[PDB]
Design a protein around this nucleic acid. Structure first.
Lengths: 108, 81, 98, 138, 18, 94, 108, 94, 98, 83
DNA sequence: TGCCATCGAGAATCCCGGTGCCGAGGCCGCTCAATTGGTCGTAGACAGCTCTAGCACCGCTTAAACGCACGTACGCGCTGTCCCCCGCGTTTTAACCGCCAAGGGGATTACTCCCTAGTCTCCAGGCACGTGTCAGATATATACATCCGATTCCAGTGCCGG
DNA sequence: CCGGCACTGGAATCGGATGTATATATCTGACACGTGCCTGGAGACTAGGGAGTAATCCCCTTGGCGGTTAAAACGCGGGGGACAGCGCGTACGTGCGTTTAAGCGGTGCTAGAGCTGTCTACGACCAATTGAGCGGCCTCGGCACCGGGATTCTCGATGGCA
């Protein structure tokens, strides 16, 4: 037998192709699942995760911090237009709100 | 347990309004806020208890709350699932 | 005796509470209220602590969003004070009320 | 189907309501072709001795606005006549406002302006209106 | 779980502004 | 006493790729796990509906691509489609 | 071989139990379907249909007509609180709107 | 080339509630849409319920719980009554 | 020399159009608009008649609902005339705009 | 053949009729342009989704079911066109 | 007579050095889930045909859309008044925290046995086609219900004298 | 200091114009029924595993108890904002005459949707390995306090100059 090589390394990915395949096969989505559907899905999920993590890390750096906390994720999501569209009806625990005071309320 | 809606005090509602950006509050706002919160909690807790009863359990778990909120279009992150 | 004009301290509190992330309602009264509401649907119920934590986070998020909408409705009518009519209008347009 | 480069990152636009606007001074000049009622010593003397209600009625006649009690005496003293001429739409609109005043109030306005308190309503109207075009030291 | 008769039909209340 | 599965190790690998000197706490990791599960369910459900509409028994990468185009906003959808196409081409050639 | 009788007649129903069972088995909902699930579902569907039809027939009678049109269904649904809640985000084609004018707009 | 719908059953129900009332074709199309919509709602809720509790079968218990989750109060009570009566009669006089 | 005062014919029009169910937009202009919008996504597209009918029905329902919300926002501010700011407020509270 | 400037085919009388069905008495003169923009955005979203559905099926014709699926996907269920 | 710029007083809000701890980040062993290799049956891709329906052009009538004018009522600004909400100091009140204890119930195996999937018949409920007649749409003729301009008509001013 | 006596303004009372509901007469096309047939649901079996039930164990939820101490409740002034009234000016509503293109009936023409048949590659399934990820444990540094200055920021009290 030749030595194993996971499908993730074959596709050049970090997310697991085999686990995504198993979830698709046991999720009651269809009768059959093609070979390339898990690869596509894993690549898309990895891309979205990297997009959020970049902004969250920048937000943490702006506050002179080393580790990301839920507040940094909330700031990153709510300051980005498309991420705000995708996660419009989502609540993040311990995230807080964006600072915003209406102009009519500030002292004259 | 009776008359526990008064435990939501006026200073707590004022803090919640300040996080929302409100500068001035009328005196009749606190009873209205209490009624709104009561209706919201009744809906969510009814759905969560239905989920608990289907599983033949006696304890409400955090997963039941998450499922109820997702049913009402109020998805919440950071509590499992 | 030093004193601040009406509105200075309110703006200070807005800035202070729009920067933190902690919960603003006390835990014990909220827990009692949750158990009281649940008594109607079923008797001798038990709760995990994480379930009450999830309920509290959802409730505070909901109320803060409603207050934001109410403040917009109040400013639309050339006021700075929020009234029950603003809450009613906001809930009507959101669809939580016929 | 393969893009190149990063992704364009647009910013969220939040709805804000108009804060509206405020101006410190309502009228830039409003000065007429005559002497100020404060420089005419005798009118300044009568203006100093008259009640707040005559001054309210006169400020309503001059500036069409209710005057604040402190400003009221300053605002009437700084009147230098009207900038419009006999027969203007403004002249007709003042003449009607004079015809609509009670005879006792016209007699009080004549006494503020050193005008004679005698004669018919229509003459008190004509005498006040000529004086409010060109305030002359009597 | 079985019950009797018809259901209690209700009226929809509409927000009115003073 | 039975094992639980999550995405923590893969999320940590992606973070080490984008920010080599940054860490993450447990609460933020739980939020990221919830996010991954949410997006997976959304895309899988849309692909299931697409297959049912056209009377097909299998879900292929065409269904995943169409679901991604239907769910994501514009630039995100374009770059996700590019990433998926690149991954599938690399997998097939190898 | 005895003479066939439909499951609907056994359940005392008008809606088709066999067709509901077939739709349940081919919709990718679960791996197996119990014997009583289609009976329960068909009964619920029949009850809801009868409720709506009973209201719409009264509306049609109140408009002095012997046939039901989409306007009657819209009036029935929008005048009933439970139905209005259930069908809150639904549009009925050619149904119109409910007559409602605010009091401030009316003449003094 | 044969297309199925719910028209005959809706007509029977109408002839039961209103013996001397008819219906138009457009109103009947709206009724078919309503029946399909409610069917998918209940079936999807029951499918998720079965998945949450790690079950392979959808029974009348799942249907009852989904009906209680989706319908408003009195509607849910009377629907539960009708469903229970139908199941009892079916299992009663087999 | 016979004239109605402003608001009389408007109230008649409200009562007339809140009783009918027909479409209020001309079909040919709407079809042209739909085809022009579609020609950006894909070229040489055909449409069924029922597709354009469904699009028009949905569009009219959407606009009528938005106008009711706008009227509520205008009456909240002590007016009888609707303005673009009322539309923006209604769309922001509905969640269709940040 | 290329189409242009059809948004003006939604005339001011039509917008007035639509506002009358919504119970509106008085309309300012700046409403018609804003309404045209709102309608254009709504139609762009729905048509984009429907054309995606059409292209997946490898068709050149948009059907009523495509519009129904797009509207249902956006949270606006319509009865009476086959779904 | 003030005014104004005066502050500077005093209060809040950053900025930086020092200490401690518990939570995140590496190791380690194991087991189970993913990987490899090989069959097999069917789902889907491709290649024709058949019509249906979608597009395109053409007169024609007529209702709707479009400018234009005028006047009324509504939007918007300004002023004044009062009462309600904010800021602050003092006294209660109970939330929070750090322990201790006991039992309920959730969470995991083991057995078994009903309950559902999978095959053959087979036959009757439901769909497609075809037709007649009656419900509803249309057309007038007429009476009733509002709208709004006008005229009349109670009492209370300006003219002019008195 | 009258005082009639015209004059005027309002009020309530018409009364024409117009819009709209109501009472018959036709008329047509869509709905409700009847018929044939075909395929999808019913009936009768068999086989295997999904779930119900019975124990069993240990975690975790519920009470109970003191002790600080910060948050909450309660008066108390006082100032700023909500609300009502008034005036002006312009921008929308109503109506009329002139333009325009929507809707309708008609006729072709062909693109493509839908169906049928034919293969074949690809996904399900099974069996044997093995290393990737998970649970458990240890360790040290990022962050939380804690304090000492330090830099701004309200708000009113003051001084100097004209």
């Amino acid at each position: 037998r030749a030595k194993a090589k996971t499908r993730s390394s074959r596709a050049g990915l970090q997310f697991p192709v085999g686990r995504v395949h198993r979830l698709l096969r046991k999720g009651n989505y269809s009768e059959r699942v093609g070979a390339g559907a898990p690869v596509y899905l894993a690549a898309v999920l990895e891309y979205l995760t990297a997009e959020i993590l970049e902004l969250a890390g920048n937000a943490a750096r702006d506050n002179k911090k080393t580790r990301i906390i839920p507040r940094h994720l909330q700031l990153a999501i709510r300051n980005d237009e498309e991420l705000n569209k995708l996660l419009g009806r989502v609540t993040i625990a311990q995230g807080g709100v964006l600072p915003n005071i209406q102009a009519v309320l500030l002292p004259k | 347990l009776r008359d526990n809606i008064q435990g939501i005090t006026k200073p707590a509602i004022r803090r919640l309004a300040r996080r929302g950006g409100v500068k001035r509050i009328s005196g009749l706002i606190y009873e209205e806020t209490r009624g709104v919160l009561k209706v919201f909690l009744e809906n969510v807790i009814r759905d969560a208890v239905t989920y608990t009863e289907h599983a033949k359990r006696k304890t409400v778990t955090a997963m039941d709350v998450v499922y109820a909120l997702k049913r009402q279009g109020r998805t919440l992150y950071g509590f499992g699932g | 005796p030093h004193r601040y004009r009406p509105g200075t301290v309110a703006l200070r509190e807005i800035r202070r509470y729009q920067k933190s992330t902690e919960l603003l309602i006390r835990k014990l009264p909220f827990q009692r209220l949750v158990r009281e509401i649940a008594q109607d649907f079923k008797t001798d119920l038990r709760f995990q602590s994480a379930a009450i934590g999830a309920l509290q986070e959802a409730s505070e998020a909901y109320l803060v969003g409603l207050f934001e909408d109410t403040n917009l409705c109040a400013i639309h009518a050339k006021r700075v004070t929020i009234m029950p009519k603003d809450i009613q209008l906001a809930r009507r347009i959101r669809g939580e009320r016929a | 189907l393969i893009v190149e480069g990063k992704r364009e990152k647009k910013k969220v636009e939040r709805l804000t309501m108009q804060v509206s606007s405020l101006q410190r001074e309502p009228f830039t000049i409003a000065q007429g072709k005559g002497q100020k009622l404060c420089e005419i010593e005798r009118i300044h003397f009568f203006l100093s001795k008259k009640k707040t209600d005559e001054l309210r009625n006169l400020h309503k006649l001059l500036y069409n606005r209710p005057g604040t009690v402190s400003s009221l005496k300053k605002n009437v003293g700084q009147f230098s006549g009207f900038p419009f001429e006999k027969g203007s739409v403004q002249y007709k609109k003042k003449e009607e406002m004079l015809k609509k005043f009670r005879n006792a109030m016209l007699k009080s306005i004549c006494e503020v302006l050193d005008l004679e308190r005698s004669g018919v309503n229509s003459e008190l109207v004509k005498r006040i209106l000529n004086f409010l075009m060109h305030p002359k030291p009597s | 779980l079985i019950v009797e008769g018809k259901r209690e039909k209700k009226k929809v209340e509409r927000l009115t502004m003073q | 006493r039975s094992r639980k599965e999550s995405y923590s190790i893969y999320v940590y690998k992606v973070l080490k790729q984008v920010h080599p000197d940054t860490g993450i706490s447990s609460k933020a990791m739980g939020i990221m796990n919830s996010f991954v599960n949410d997006i997976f369910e959304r895309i899988a459900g849309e692909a299931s509906r697409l297959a049912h509409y056209n009377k097909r028994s299998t879900i292929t990468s065409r269904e995943i691509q169409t679901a991604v185009r239907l769910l994501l906003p514009g630039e995100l959808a374009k770059h996700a489609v590019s990433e998926g196409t690149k991954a599938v081409t690399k997998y097939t050639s190898a």
